[PDB]
Design a protein around this motif. Sequence first.
Motif, mmCIF file in Angstrom:
data_model
loop_
_atom_site.group_PDB
_atom_site.id
_atom_site.type_symbol
_atom_site.label_atom_id
_atom_site.label_comp_id
_atom_site.label_asym_id
_atom_site.label_seq_id
_atom_site.Cartn_x
_atom_site.Cartn_y
_atom_site.Cartn_z
ATOM 1 N N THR A 193 -3.723 42.986 87.402
ATOM 2 C CA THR A 193 -2.955 42.557 86.082
ATOM 3 C C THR A 193 -3.317 41.376 85.551
ATOM 4 O O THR A 193 -3.467 41.341 84.297
ATOM 5 C CB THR A 193 -1.424 42.335 86.700
ATOM 6 N N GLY A 199 -8.276 43.509 79.795
ATOM 7 C CA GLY A 199 -8.153 45.342 79.944
ATOM 8 C C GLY A 199 -9.038 45.986 79.440
ATOM 9 O O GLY A 199 -8.721 47.160 79.022
ATOM 10 N N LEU A 253 0.386 55.488 94.432
ATOM 11 C CA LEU A 253 1.646 55.762 93.755
ATOM 12 C C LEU A 253 2.212 57.079 94.012
ATOM 13 O O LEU A 253 3.577 57.000 94.160
ATOM 14 C CB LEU A 253 1.020 56.253 92.422
ATOM 15 N N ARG A 310 9.299 58.924 87.758
ATOM 16 C CA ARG A 310 10.384 57.858 87.761
ATOM 17 C C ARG A 310 11.812 58.540 88.243
ATOM 18 O O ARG A 310 12.755 57.712 88.822
ATOM 19 C CB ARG A 310 10.448 57.426 86.365
ATOM 20 N N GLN A 340 5.493 57.695 85.269
ATOM 21 C CA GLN A 340 5.204 56.253 85.224
ATOM 22 C C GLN A 340 3.947 55.953 86.174
ATOM 23 O O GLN A 340 3.749 56.682 87.195
ATOM 24 C CB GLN A 340 6.288 55.410 85.598
ATOM 25 N N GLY A 341 3.449 54.841 85.956
ATOM 26 C CA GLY A 341 2.295 54.458 86.718
ATOM 27 C C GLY A 341 0.962 54.682 86.269
ATOM 28 O O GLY A 341 0.729 55.272 85.089
ATOM 29 N N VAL A 342 0.043 54.493 87.263
ATOM 30 C CA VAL A 342 -1.452 54.945 87.025
ATOM 31 C C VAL A 342 -1.331 56.490 87.450
ATOM 32 O O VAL A 342 -1.468 56.702 88.662
ATOM 33 C CB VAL A 342 -2.261 53.975 87.516
ATOM 34 N N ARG A 361 -3.376 59.722 88.495
ATOM 35 C CA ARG A 361 -4.382 60.583 88.956
ATOM 36 C C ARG A 361 -4.281 61.570 89.733
ATOM 37 O O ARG A 361 -2.910 61.740 89.450
ATOM 38 C CB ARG A 361 -5.365 59.496 89.610
ATOM 39 N N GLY A 364 -0.657 61.003 91.776
ATOM 40 C CA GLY A 364 0.447 61.203 90.978
ATOM 41 C C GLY A 364 0.784 62.278 90.171
ATOM 42 O O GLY A 364 1.613 63.039 90.235
ATOM 43 N N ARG A 408 6.786 55.537 80.070
ATOM 44 C CA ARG A 408 6.499 54.369 81.291
ATOM 45 C C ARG A 408 5.020 54.612 81.939
ATOM 46 O O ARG A 408 4.755 53.807 82.986
ATOM 47 C CB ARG A 408 7.388 54.478 82.346
ATOM 48 N N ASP A 446 1.342 53.989 82.454
ATOM 49 C CA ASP A 446 0.293 53.260 81.874
ATOM 50 C C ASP A 446 -0.981 53.837 81.505
ATOM 51 O O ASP A 446 -1.457 53.409 80.333
ATOM 52 C CB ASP A 446 -0.138 52.232 83.038
ATOM 53 N N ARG A 447 -1.626 54.914 82.135
ATOM 54 C CA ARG A 447 -2.667 55.617 81.738
ATOM 55 C C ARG A 447 -2.936 56.785 82.860
ATOM 56 O O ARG A 447 -2.407 56.764 83.887
ATOM 57 C CB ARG A 447 -3.735 54.665 81.997
#
Lengths: 415, 415
Positions: free
Chosen positions: A47, A221, A312, A318, A332-334, A336, A339, A383, A385-386
């Motif tokens: 972060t 970033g 994740l 979520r 949500q989250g990163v 790949r 997830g 939600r 991130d990427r």
Amino acid sequence: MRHPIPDYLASLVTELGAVNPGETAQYIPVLAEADPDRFGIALATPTGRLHCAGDADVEFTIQSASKPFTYAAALVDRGFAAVDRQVGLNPSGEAFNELSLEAESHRPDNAMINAGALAVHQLLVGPEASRKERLDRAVEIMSLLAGRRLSVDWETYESEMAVSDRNLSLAHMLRSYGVLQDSAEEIVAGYVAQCAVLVTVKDLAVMGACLATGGIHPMTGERMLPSIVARRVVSVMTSSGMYDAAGQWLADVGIPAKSGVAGGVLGALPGRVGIGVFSPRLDEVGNSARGVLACRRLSEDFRLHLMDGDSLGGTAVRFVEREGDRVFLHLQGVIRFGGAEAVLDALTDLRTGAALSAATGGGAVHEAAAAGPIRTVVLNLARVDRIDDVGRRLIAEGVRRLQADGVRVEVEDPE
Amino acid sequence: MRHPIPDYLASLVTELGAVNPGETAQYIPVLAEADPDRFGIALATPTGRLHCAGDADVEFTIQSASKPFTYAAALVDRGFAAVDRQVGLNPSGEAFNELSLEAESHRPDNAMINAGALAVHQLLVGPEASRKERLDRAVEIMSLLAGRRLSVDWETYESEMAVSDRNLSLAHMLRSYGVLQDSAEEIVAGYVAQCAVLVTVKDLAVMGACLATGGIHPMTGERMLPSIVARRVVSVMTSSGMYDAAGQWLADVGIPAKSGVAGGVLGALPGRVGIGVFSPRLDEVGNSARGVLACRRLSEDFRLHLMDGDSLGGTAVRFVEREGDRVFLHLQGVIRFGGAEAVLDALTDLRTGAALSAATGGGAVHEAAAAGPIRTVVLNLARVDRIDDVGRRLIAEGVRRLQADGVRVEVEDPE
């Protein structure tokens, strides 16, 4: 309030600071006479937070800890094929054995040993690059990941050059096998200057963090390196960073790292933290005695390890809501593979044709089975991130099979 | 709908199934005459899903792929100290070199090579354990992680025993160095029976999944092994599973794995998946040709790799709300250092004394700065699956420093 990590670090510095075993690199006065009573450490997060203590703002030459960064620059500048033909991926001791070159079609074992580092420097900008370009490129990659312009300690440089017979031996042998095209003197001078780049414990932490994130700079970033390149670099750090002690190090510490003879230790744990440590005295094998011990402590105390199942997973989902006719699935989250795989489970647990979860970590995937028929599904990515290419394709295919069920699917994707 | 992964697997089986290079282990008729036209694969997830294709339900002897499981049982039964005194953590080729025993105070290099596996079997239940107990214990650990009672193929066993001179050589040398206390014949017979345990591709996947989760069985959620033990096992799988090819394998595949001469390949990627593959023919170094190639494909196609930054991170903070006087901070996922660290950031970004996030993966940590003074904070853990000791202590200390700010803190923790 006050963040506790910097406090943990202060404790550690005081603890391990109690003693100071070993001695400073004796091969050159600049390092031989350096003040030994110095000890700092830093922990940069993904972060962008930077925790530290002790002499974490004191500059010292990066030495060997520079090898993974020039490796990253070479892979970026020349591509994998060009680099893998000159540099292997096999771990080994720093001691040189000619049979190792005749082996695997003439190439040093890895980028972490001196012979490999020389070959990497040779590959730095391109076949027609000048000495000055390759040196600048080495300083550039390191500065870009540190987030500030770094300087070369020319005093340490010259001191090193006066006793560079060994590196010259390696370079000449590499030339003999066609691994180096320029002169031995030229490549060794470039590598020696590269090692004389000045850094603080905090810089190493930040630079380590770029690698831990897959090539993304934690403070801005911006993607500094491709993820595959950052992945290859941490990979070789793990298998070869600690030479023949790598196996034991992976097992007992589990943090990919590399020490330098000036006392700096670089650490990079994917997805968690960038580590910088400084402590002059080296142990019997040339590694910073406290630096290496400090990495071992962080590993054990924070239970940080490359083999951690810190993913994740199902938490990618979520939540899932069934208002009446339509279903609302938020991600949500990163994202790949891990997830995305979970998301596919959610989409499949619906009929278009609790305790177990928490016990493992399926997040809100179970809310899929729990959720009149289903005519429309809404995938909200606000939600998230990427998502990497793999995740995108898996979810893209997931949405495609929903429609194939004659189910309406709307993807709310703000950004 | 239909889950796409099983489909990806079918494709792969068809693709790689197009050819069948190499040959079956020729040292024994049972393996020499086995049907070569067989090919299966399985992918067991943490949550408990099991994707597969081809001959993934066909039993074969586990052979070497049994080594990490007996290693886990030994560490559990005797503790690290007792096992590390007899087994090292250094990678090496299967070829035996006596100097390696005289090295590091008499102990084979690692649990993945035969000499190490013999020492591990010797350590199985205890110093006074009988042959039958150690064999049962080996079958037990493997069955417990597979989730079903496994059988020993006695036919393959006897066939192996008739040509066990090499393993007998290793065992006798180990006895000479005090690494084995029982007879060479007894320990070799135990190890040979252990290798004759029957498994399918699906079992390996499930067994691999237990290791990938840190010791939790994906189908029931029960902890089969301590996390430190599972961590040590995957660690040695990575550094030594592929012998001297381990470095290259870590870099280019990044999936900890171990092949067996019957054609089975075991894979275990922390936090993501358990892999089982089956394909009889071995390549020039004794590994399942397609099994190893299938692992390489999954790695590249799904972009799965041990160096992935696939971590919960800031996503540990589901969201932060400031209704008026009080703040509501909700957590979620599997909380260990990474997530807990993020939580500490949230608690600190409040004053008790966006794009950057998504670019990295800080989740809802940024909502902390965004959120009259603050007299009470509510930590809701309802959405949190579980938290390790480290996370508990970090969050415990975080709550302690809040109160120290004269801030009321209520922890809503259903379970």
